[PDB]
């Protein structure tokens, strides 16, 4: 149909495109490169090409598909590596043995050769069926045992033919509905535009904690299943540890990794540990890859693919939320996504807002982030899923002045800020307690009252101690420790103990790779008990130096409480923590006399 009129980088202007619509995928060039319309000027349409644009000639055809940038949703989506446009990298490499990605490769995103065992759902012939309805189930993985086949949203009608139980390839007809005379055939899979969030009946309040396993996060700044979170991109911090922890231990029924703007070798990283990491919460040692699909997007890939990586990942997360599965999305660097948006706006000649970033940066991050919350999935049967968006941010110049973080802070409920004072001193996970926050503390009071009643109280106590000792340290660093009262010395020592033995987490150690919520709660109890008994004893005249030397044993016990193996079970670990608390009370009662 259309023909190229202009090429300048990924931006291509095609004439005779009078019928094209906004954000509609077109096949640019003889190789049929994937690109979408960005602007329309009559018969001329601006197209951002998703692959390398070199070699394009003025006049070669541009056929418009009529569909926006969509993502294939169905069985085979799991255990698969994708790019931003959801091109199966493994299938691409097997179809073309080349080490490179061929230009204009059009392998189907989801495998069409695998025969899935389909179990028909509740609906029968003649039953009216609506968007999001589960009309069948599919055994995909040994871990995703029931991959439920949903009728596509924005599609409804009277069922006229539903396939019986059996094995079906991805392209075979499964359901044939009749709406008003127009009759539609449905298969195992369906396409959904990555720009439009998948509809749900109702967005609930995310009220169950998403246990990351890092003590500082789960204790001071907790996140919830269905929440939005900002993490620094610095490695050694939660950028590399928290992703693995959430993929390996969290209660998410699925994981969606979106590595937009990733370095080449750091991509080869997450493609080898993820196939080699295993789960225990399923009752059997199963790989995480059965819960996970990856959207691999290196930095040398086209900028439009970088922009679409986040959207395709969040659309996959939405699709698995619509099945009633708590799915966590990990975005490697939304800062790289923001830079992709900036580059695209630069190619489009749009007026930037601040430091070159597009004016709609906050709007785009909002439209992405608010696709997260806990929801009641569309259609019947009634079910509930959630999308915990765990998005990392790479800071610019090491301060929060960059527009990406400023726009992010107005959306995310949880912000796990970075502290270069902790990062430089190799105190990991290095989360800035002073500026990090979590607005889910109030929502989690219902969870805490049921399970760990004193958890909010101890978290507030630790925050108060840390803040008081932080101001005490900033005074001391100019004055010194000579004139401080004994209580001030206890505050400083207790906060140092907290920072070194509760907040600090190795992450690469068996005893502390994943700190369970009960262990974290018991450790908060132990540390707050240490502070409380020390303050009570010093209030009764006891000199702090003598008390410290005589209670170094219980100080070491509190310090080494972190060394308890979580694998020993909640009962054993809790009993031993109770033993530690009783020992501390006895020791302080003895030494206070």
């Amino acid at each position: 149909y259309g023909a190229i009129y202009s090429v300048s980088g990924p931006v291509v202007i095609a004439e005779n495109m009078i019928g094209c619509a906004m954000y509609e995928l077109v096949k640019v060039g003889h190789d049929n490169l994937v690109g979408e319309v960005i602007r329309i000027d009559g018969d001329k349409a601006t197209i951002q090409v998703y692959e390398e644009t070199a070699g394009l000639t003025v006049g070669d055809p541009v056929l418009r598909t009529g569909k926006p940038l969509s993502v294939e949703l169905g069985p085979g989506l799991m255990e698969t590596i994708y790019d931003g446009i959801q091109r199966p990298l493994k299938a691409i490499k097997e179809e073309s043995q080349s080490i490179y990605i061929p230009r204009g490769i059009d392998t189907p995103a989801l495998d069409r050769t695998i025969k899935w065992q389909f179990t028909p759902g509740k609906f029968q012939v003649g039953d009216h069926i609506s968007g999001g309805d589960i009309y069948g189930s599919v055994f995909e993985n040994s871990l995703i045992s029931s991959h439920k086949i949903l009728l596509p949203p924005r599609s409804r009608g009277t069922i006229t033919w539903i396939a019986p139980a059996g094995e079906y390839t991805l392209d075979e007809k499964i359901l044939e509905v009749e709406f008003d005379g127009k009759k539609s055939d449905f298969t195992l899979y369906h396409t959904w535009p990555v720009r439009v969030p998948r509809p749900v009946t109702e967005k609930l309040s995310a009220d169950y904690p998403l246990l990351t396993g890092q003590r500082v996060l789960d204790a001071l700044f907790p996140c919830v299943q269905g929440g939005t979170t900002c993490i620094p991109g610095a490695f050694g911090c939660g950028k590399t540890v928290i992703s693995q922890s959430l993929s390996k231990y969290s209660n998410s029924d699925a994981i969606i990794y979106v590595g937009c703007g990733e370095r080449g070798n750091e991509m080869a990283e997450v493609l080898m540990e993820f196939p080699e990491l295993y789960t225990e919460m399923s009752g059997t040692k199963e790989p995480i890859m059965k819960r996970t699909t990856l959207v691999a997007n290196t930095s040398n890939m086209p900028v439009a693919a970088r922009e679409a990586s986040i959207y395709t990942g969040i659309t996959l997360a939405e699709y698995f939320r619509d099945q009633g599965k708590n799915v966590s999305m990990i975005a490697d660097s939304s800062s790289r996504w923001a830079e992709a948006l900036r580059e695209i706006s630069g190619r489009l000649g749009e007026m930037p807002a601040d430091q070159g970033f597009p004016a709609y940066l906050g709007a785009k991050l909002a439209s992405f982030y608010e696709r997260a919350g806990k929801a009641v999935a569309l259609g019947s049967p009634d079910r509930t899923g959630s999308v915990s968006i765990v998005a990392a941010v790479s800071p610019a110049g090491g301060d929060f002045s960059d527009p990406v973080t400023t726009a992010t802070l107005g959306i995310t409920q949880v912000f796990w800020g970075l502290d270069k004072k902790l990062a430089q001193r190799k105190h990991f996970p290095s989360i800035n307690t002073s500026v990090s926050y979590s607005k889910y503390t109030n929502v989690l009071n219902k969870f805490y009252d049921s399970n760990y009643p004193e958890f909010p109280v101890l978290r507030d106590r630790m925050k108060e101690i840390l803040s008081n000792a932080e101001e005490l340290e900033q005074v001391v660093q100019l004055v010194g420790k000579s004139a401080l009262s004994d209580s001030d010395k206890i505050t400083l020592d207790v906060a140092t103990l907290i920072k070194e033995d509760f907040l600090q987490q190795n992450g690469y150690s068996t005893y502390d790779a994943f700190c369970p919520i009960w262990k974290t709660f018991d450790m908060m109890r132990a540390f707050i008990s240490y502070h409380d008994e020390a303050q009570k004893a010093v209030a009764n005249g006891a000199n702090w130096s003598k008390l410290a030397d005589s209670t170094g044993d219980v100080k070491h016990a509190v310090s080494s409480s972190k060394f308890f193996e979580p694998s020993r079970g909640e009962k054993e670990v809790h009993g031993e923590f109770e033993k530690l608390l009783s020992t501390m009370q006895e020791r302080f009662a003895e030494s206070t006399d």
Binding site: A21, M22, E370, R461, S485
Partner: protein, 475 residues
């Protein structure tokens, strides 16, 4: 006579499929007939979905429509645009209270349409300065940190400066839940002649905290006084621009035609500023300071100055804008301009928030410029001003003594400093620290402040008048 509306006329609307181009968030039309500058239009997408659009530019037979909720799916061949012929008028009525509206004026409480008494035009004309009168009475908030020491008058425009992650949204919810008039009277303030109302506007508000506002107001009975204007962060940007205008138009209607006392909470003014910057850069304007366009002092002024009490109407408008300081600085354009236009500011401190104090209102920097007009004998209690002054003085002395506690030692402090440490302790964790659902009347907060001040001796409660001091401190 009220029957002068003459709205029975029927105005047919022209619908054009003559879309000439699409450029980001705006659609250009090639053959419009006599376009209006700020006209609201309806776009009919080829798939049938209808989207609103506001005209941004009108050249000769050319109109540039900036479209709500994006521009995806629009083609130059099949879509049609219907021109309404009027700007974004909103339906107003005395029974808009208890209704929760979208940022575009559409109700979102599953209720009916507004059933307008009048379609009052948005961004109405400015209040005549000769008609304004000085604020003269206190609007209560139920927060001791605000009622006692930063008292808000009935026409005052006082922002709440805050930052990301601080509980400014919950403070706004508490104020909306507990605000009202102070003086006890023979008839309650829920009547038809001395009534009070609240207009709550949320701009760019997160979905979680938007639901929080909705559930909090619908459950605590504040809804019957509140007209809530929710605007999600993923809602259209032009909707964010119009949301405070909707709220202030409703407040103007209520206060200056129904003669209500209206409190207006404009939460997340920084998100509104971000939306304003996006709209400005959509018109190819070159950004001003810190990327924000250079003309928003005018727009923030138009938002803020739609307040105060007036000559001929017994009603009044009190505004409490709430803005998050980005990176926690006053030099940022948004807090700077708000300080230019508004009387005073309330500060929410991160240091207080980390200590577990709620509300984390830092009272040393917070100031109510015209607090003195909200306090007096017939206005709260005769001791309000000097108790507030004494609280401020002793709190500052306590902070200084807390600085010296770690430098010269506890015992080297003066007796006033030893009293000041424990006064600051009791102050921050009993008086400033107020439960999220603890409603303290101004007199309860005043006598709590007195109970805090009863620890000090006569000689150095020097900033309280000796008459008041000798009538209140000694028993």
């Amino acid at each position: 006579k009220k029957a002068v509306e003459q709205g029975f006329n029927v105005k047919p609307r022209l619908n054009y499929n003559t879309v000439s181009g699409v450029n980001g968030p705006l659609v250009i039309l090639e053959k419009v007939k006599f376009p209006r500058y700020n006209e609201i239009v309806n776009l009919t997408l080829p798939d049938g979905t209808v989207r609103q659009g506001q005209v941004l530019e009108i050249r000769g037979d050319r109109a540039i429509v900036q479209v709500f909720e994006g521009t995806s799916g629009i083609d130059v061949k099949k879509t049609t645009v219907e021109f309404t012929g009027e700007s974004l008028r909103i339906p107003v009525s005395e029974d808009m209270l208890g209704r929760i509206f979208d940022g575009s004026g559409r109700p979102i409480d599953n209720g009916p349409k507004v059933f307008a008494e009048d379609y009052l035009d948005i961004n109405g004309s400015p209040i005549n300065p000769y008609a304004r009168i000085y604020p003269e009475e206190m609007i209560s908030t139920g927060v001791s940190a605000i009622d006692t020491m930063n008292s808000i008058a009935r026409g005052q425009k006082i922002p709440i400066f805050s930052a990301s992650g601080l509980p400014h949204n919950e403070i706004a919810a508490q104020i909306c839940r507990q605000a009202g008039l102070v003086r006890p009277t023979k008839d309650v303030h829920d009547g038809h002649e001395e009534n009070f109302s609240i207009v709550f506007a949320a701009m760019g508000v997160n979905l979680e905290t938007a639901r929080f506002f909705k559930q909090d107001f619908e459950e605590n009975g504040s809804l019957e006084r509140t007209s809530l204007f929710l605007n999600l962060a993923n809602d259209p940007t032009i909707e964010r621009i119009i949301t405070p205008r909707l709220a202030l138009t409703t407040a103007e209607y209520l206060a200056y035609q129904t003669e209500r006392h209206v409190l207006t909470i404009l939460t997340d003014m920084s998100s509104y500023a971000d939306a304003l910057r996006e709209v400005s850069a959509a018109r190819e304007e070159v950004p001003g300071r810190r990327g924000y366009p250079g003309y928003m002092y005018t727009d923030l002024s138009t938002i803020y100055e739609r307040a105060g009490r007036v000559e001929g109407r017994n009603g009044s408008i009190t505004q409490i804008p709430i803005l998050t300081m980005p990176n926690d600085d006053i030099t940022h354009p948004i807090p700077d301009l708000t300080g230019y236009i508004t009387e005073g500011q309330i500060f929410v401190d991160r240091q207080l928030h980390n200590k577990g104090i709620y509300p984390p209102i830092n009272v040393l920097p917070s100031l109510s410029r015209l607090m003195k007009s909200a306090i007096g004998e017939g206005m709260t209690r005769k001791d309000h001003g000097d108790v507030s002054n004494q609280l401020y003085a002793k709190y500052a002395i306590g902070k200084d003594a807390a600085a010296m506690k770690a430098v010269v030692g506890e015992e080297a402090l003066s007796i006033e400093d030893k009293l000041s440490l424990e006064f600051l302790e009791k102050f921050e964790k009993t008086f400033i620290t107020q439960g999220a659902y603890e409603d303290r009347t101004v007199f309860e907060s005043l006598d709590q402040a007195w109970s805090l001040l009863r620890i000090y001796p006569k000689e150095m409660l020097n900033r309280i008048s000796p008459k008041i001091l000798d009538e209140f401190y000694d028993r």
